[PDB]
Design a protein around this ligand. Structure first.
Ligand SMILES: CCc1nc(Nc2ccc(CCO)cc2)nc(-c2cccc(Cl)c2)n1
Ligand SMILES: [Mg+2]
Ligand SMILES: [Zn+2]
Length: 339
């Protein structure tokens, strides 16, 4: 019954707008595991890299287990979303056959793990509260280093090493790439990642069919980084009914952080006070200063494969703008997305 219903939903796996919460419900809360399984099958990754399927599922389950259920936004469902969004972006026509199987695997694996073991509070909070994680990582890309460490550490569990049949050289190459990718999801790197991307765009060379030419490692990894960062910041480009659910979830996570700051007598971080909240104005700010600039630039790079994403983005802005009842934003943007 429910498995017949789940398999129909998964037929939308190559579509922006997949009903990822439905899949979350239908899979017994195993969206990351079911979506990754599907994507590996779709892209023949098991055959290519000789990944026993039992080993895959075992790895996925443990990975998914290490996302925290009680965290409202940074959980397995968000990870599942990002995996799938990256999977779609990898098939964009301007990228047809640009990437090797290994590079593709790296991007999908990076996406699956990029937020694993997230505690639901920001780097800054971890630094300001003197947490063990901030002490371990010397205040630099604290969460993102930890995600990486956890994601690779889990490969060592019984029957979890999905990479056992890669060569030593494929393993090293893949590990560099994943690290470069997940470190680029540290939000404080955003302005620089975008600036560099704009620059690359200016000197970009395509084929007759509009397909991108990427000579070196440096250009390829940069594209993979921006790709996964776009997927990470893809919520406002989705159908509004999904976008709104995510908005409610992210704000619930922030407020919970704010509640922890309050209880402890700390200044309440921007965006994190439920009592001085402005949810709608904030999303508009978020689109104008971060998301739209980012997607506009990605839209140039793959022109014109993403026109529609921009269209949806613009509609979605209108919606939020229309529901604003008739410094925080700015301070949040200064603190989160700059170095
Ligand atoms: C609903 C989709 C959504 N995603 C995001 N991602 C996102 C942003 C920052 C962090 C770092 C702290 O952990 C993590 C995830 N950020 C917003 C947001 C909300 C209010 C104001 C602003 Cl400028 C943005 N909205
Ligand atoms: Mg993250
Ligand atoms: Zn994320």
């Amino acid at each position: 019954e429910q498995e017949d219903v789940l398999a129909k939903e998964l037929e939308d796996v190559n579509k922006w707008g997949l009903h990822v919460f439905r899949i979350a419900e239908l899979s017994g809360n195993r969206p990351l595991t079911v979506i990754m399984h599907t994507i590996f099958q779709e892209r023949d990754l098991l055959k290519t890299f000789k990944i026993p399927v039992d080993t895959l599922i075992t790895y996925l389950m443990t990975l998914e287990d290490h996302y925290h259920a009680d965290v409202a936004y940074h959980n397995n469902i968000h990870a599942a979303d990002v995996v799938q969004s990256t999977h779609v972006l990898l098939s964009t026509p301007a990228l047809e056959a640009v990437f090797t199987d290994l590079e593709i695997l790296a991007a999908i694996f990076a996406s699956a793990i990029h937020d694993v073991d997230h505690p639901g509070v920001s780097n800054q909070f971890l630094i300001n509260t003197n947490s063990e994680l901030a002490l371990m990582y010397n205040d630099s890309s604290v969460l993102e280093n930890h995600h990486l460490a956890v994601g690779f550490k889990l490969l060592q569990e019984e029957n979890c090493d999905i990479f056992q049949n890669l060569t030593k050289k494929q393993r090293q190459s893949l590990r560099k790439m994943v690290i470069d990718i997940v470190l680029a999801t540290d939000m404080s790197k955003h302005m620089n990642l975008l600036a560099d991307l704009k620059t690359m765009v200016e000197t970009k060379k395509v084929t007759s069919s509009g397909v991108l030419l990427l000579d070196n490692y440096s250009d390829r990894i940069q594209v993979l980084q921006n790709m996964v960062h776009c997927a990470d910041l893809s919520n406002p480009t989705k159908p509004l009914q999904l976008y709104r659910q995510w908005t409610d979830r992210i704000m619930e996570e922030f407020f919970r952080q704010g509640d922890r700051e309050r209880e402890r007598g700390m200044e309440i971080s921007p965006m994190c006070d439920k009592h001085n909240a402005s949810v709608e104005k904030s999303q508009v700010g978020f689109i104008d200063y971060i998301v739209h600039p980012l997607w506009e630039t990605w839209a140039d790079l793959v022109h014109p494969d993403a026109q529609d994403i921009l269209d949806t983005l613009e509609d979605n802005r209108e919606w939020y703008q229309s529901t604003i009842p008739q410094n925080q934003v700015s301070e949040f943007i200064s603190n989160t997305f700059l170095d």
